[PDB]
UniProtKB/Swiss-Prot annotation, chain C:
Biotechnology: Promising transmission-blocking vaccine candidate: targeting the protein would prevents transmission of the parasite decreasing the malaria burden. The LMIV230-01 transmission-blocking antibody against the 6-Cys domain 1 also binds to the heterologous P.falciparum Malian isolate 20-2217-0 which carries a 'Ser-605' polymorphism and to the heterologous St Lucia strain which carries 'Ser-605' and 'Asn-661' polymorphisms.
Span covered, complete protein: 1108 to 1291 of 3135
Disulfide bonds: 33-54, 68-144, 93-142
Function: Gametocyte surface protein required for male/female gamete fusion. Also required for male gamete exflagellation and interaction with host erythrocytes.
Residues bearing glycans: 46, 160
Residues annotated as domain 6-Cys: 29-168
Compartments where found: Cell surface; Cell membrane
Assembly and interaction partners: Heterodimer; heterodimerizes with PF45/48.
Modification note: May be processed into a 310 kDa form as the parasite emerges from the host erythrocytes.
Record gene name: PFS230
Protein name: Gametocyte surface protein P230
Length: 212, 221, 184
């Protein structure tokens, strides 16, 4: 079958700057190519059909070009809400094949995280489990490292992390770290601390609480 | 203008079968070709097949032929897709799309997507817990508060604050899968500290597979 | 070709049945697209490997062909070789035809069409255009995958309100051993 190759896989562009996404085919497809754009948690949306024509209601800033084997998708002025992943599709011969997809990101400036920690709830303690949650917000870049300390003793193998999709409100990352401990182990210690190291911090940032 | 309505998520045993549905409104179903798209791990689109209700003809992608069956109901303006012998590779989100009958086949309208999960762990309901910023050093500046959703399966879970109010400043984190096979999720919201003692914040958690609805209040302690 | 066969009931003191059949050639050319390297003498359009699409115009009582596999010429030694895994979409090419992306049966386009296939060969497939009332210029197509390359055939079914008045073809005479000869 006909196979699309779409490059670059990850593309970075500042807000308000032009960006172009390329597409290459394996055989002549004349003018049967389409482009799709998808938000996280939302269905893909069609932008370009016939590889050079905007679809009804598509903003003028989205354009496409190419014929035969090399096809390009171009955005004249990227917006803050344009954070999405773009796919190409051929409509010449069945089966219709989708491209590998290309993700578009915004740069912005470097920002330091603000750290919060949440103590285990009384309801969870009734079930015999204790969980400590650490919250990080509005930090760039994504490489934020989190470490947990209980009574100044480092913890490993009992924590998990989760990063969001860089919410388009301010194009910054957020990370949450959860430490899972048993109720019996929780009662054996007094001080619970989490250490955060990030590019925007000149020194590690420590938040602590006393509960026990 | 044009709406495509799909069913909720499914959770079947290995080797089972599903029959999802796609309801179309705002246009005549016979006037547009309709197809399904598979999203492998949510990062790679795949074309499954299409059906034309105008003549009943069906076209299936070769590696999906036989494994899937497509049918339409013109009386109800609803179309159905069936999968045979579900395997872990089939666990993906399936979307319904609308396209022209003849000429171009560009997919114009998309549904909200139906998630099909091949059960690798038993069904379980979420446990909602409050996250109180207070009872600590200090709640400087704005006070960030949230809720903890732990030990639920399968995905997804919907979290809302104040019955859909206070949309701004809400951060819902992606779920994390534990060694026990149970997902865990955390959602937080940033509010001014001056409203800690004069405002009520309530988180709504809904889990369709277990039909669990929890409305937990978050207050300082 | 002139032959018989039938049943004989002499041993049971019955009668004898005989069927007399004759077969004669009707036309020498078939308007079909051959995408394979081996050319066909009875196919009007042989398409070079550099070209991946072929377009034809169809009309009543005309035969359309579509070949994407090898053909055994008398210069080739016939042997028992399995047919190549030719990816033909639809599985049957001309009883059900592609009108774009959706498959439609040929009888919905043409009024009671007659189609011919080969039991022991996947391709070629043929269609004889029946008398039809669908005067519109309708497009139908098949496709084959030859050596990981997709070949597509396009057929333009047309029936004008007025048939073409004349079709004049001019040819130049050729000299063959001091004799003026003309092809066709």
């Amino acid at each position: 079958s006909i196979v699309m190759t779409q490059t670059p896989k990850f593309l970075l562009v500042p807000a308000g700057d032009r960006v172009t996404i390329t597409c290459k085919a394996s055989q002549s497809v004349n003018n049967d190519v389409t482009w799709y754009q998808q938000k996280p948690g939302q269905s893909p949306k069609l932008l370009i059909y016939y590889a050079s024509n905007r679809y009804t209601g598509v903003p003028d800033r989205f354009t496409g070009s190419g014929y035969g084997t090399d096809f390009t998708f171009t955005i004249s002025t990227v917006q803050a809400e344009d954070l999405a992943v773009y796919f190409c599709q051929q409509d010449y011969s069945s089966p219709l094949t989708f491209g590998a997809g290309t993700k578009l990101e915004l740069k912005r400036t470097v920002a330091a995280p603000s750290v919060f920690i949440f103590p285990p709830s009384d309801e969870q303690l009734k079930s015999g489990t204790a969980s400590v949650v650490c919250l990080l917000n509005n930090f760039y870049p994504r490489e934020a490292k989190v470490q947990w300390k209980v009574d100044n003793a480092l913890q490993s193998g009992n924590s998990q992390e989760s990063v969001t999709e860089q919410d388009s409100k301010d194009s910054t990352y957020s990370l949450s770290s959860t430490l899972t401990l048993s109720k019996a182990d929780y009662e054996k210690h007094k001080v619970y601390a989490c250490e955060v190291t990030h590019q925007g911090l000149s020194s590690p940032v420590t938040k602590s609480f006393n509960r026990g | 203008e044009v709406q495509l309505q799909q069913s909720g998520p499914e959770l079947e045993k290995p080797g089972a079968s599903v029959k999802i549905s796609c309801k179309a409104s705002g246009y005549s179903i016979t006037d547009y070709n309709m197809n399904w798209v598979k999203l492998s791990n949510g990062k790679s689109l795949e074309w499954i097949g299409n059906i034309d209700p105008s003549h009943g003809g069906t076209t299936y992608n070769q590696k999906f032929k036989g494994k899937a069956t497509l049918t339409v109901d013109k009386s109800s303006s609803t179309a159905y897709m069936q999968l045979k012998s579900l395997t872990s590779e089939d666990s993906a989100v399936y979307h319904c799309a609308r396209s022209t009958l003849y000429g171009n086949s560009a997919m114009d309208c998309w549904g909200q997507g139906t998630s099909v999960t091949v059960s690798s762990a038993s069904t379980k309901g979420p446990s909602v817990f409050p996250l109180a910023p207070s009872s600590k050093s200090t709640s400087g500046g704005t006070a960030a508060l949230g809720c903890l959703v732990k030990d639920y399966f399968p995905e997804p879970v919907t979290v809302s604050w104040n019955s859909g109010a206070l949309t701004s400043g809400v951060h819902t984190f992606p779920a994390v899968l534990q060694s026990s096979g149970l997902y865990s999720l955390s959602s937080v919201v940033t509010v001014p500290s001056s409203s800690l003692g004069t405002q009520t914040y309530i988180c709504n958690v809904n889990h369709k597979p277990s039909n669990t609805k929890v409305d937990k209040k978050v207050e300082p302690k | 070709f002139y032959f018989m066969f039938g049943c004989n009931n002499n041993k049971g003191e019955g009668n004898i049945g005989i069927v007399e059949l004759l077969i004669s050639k009707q036309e020498e050319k078939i308007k079909g697209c051959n995408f394979h390297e081996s050319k066909l003498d009875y196919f009007n359009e042989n398409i070079s490997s550099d070209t991946h699409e072929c377009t034809l115009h169809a009309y009543e009582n005309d035969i359309i062909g579509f070949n994407c596999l090898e053909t055994t010429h008398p210069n080739e030694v016939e042997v028992e070789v399995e047919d190549a895994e030719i990816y033909l979409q639809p599985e049957n090419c001309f009883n059900n035809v592609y009108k774009g992306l959706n498959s439609v049966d040929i009888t919905t386009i043409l009024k009671n069409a007659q189609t011919y296939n080969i039991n022991n060969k996947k391709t070629p497939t043929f269609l004889k255009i029946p008398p039809y009332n669908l005067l519109e210029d309708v497009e139908i197509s098949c496709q084959c995958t030859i050596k990981q390359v997709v070949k597509k055939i396009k057929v333009i079914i047309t029936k004008n309100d007025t048939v073409l008045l004349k079709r004049e073809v001019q040819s130049e005479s050729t000299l063959d051993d001091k004799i003026y000869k003309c092809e066709h």
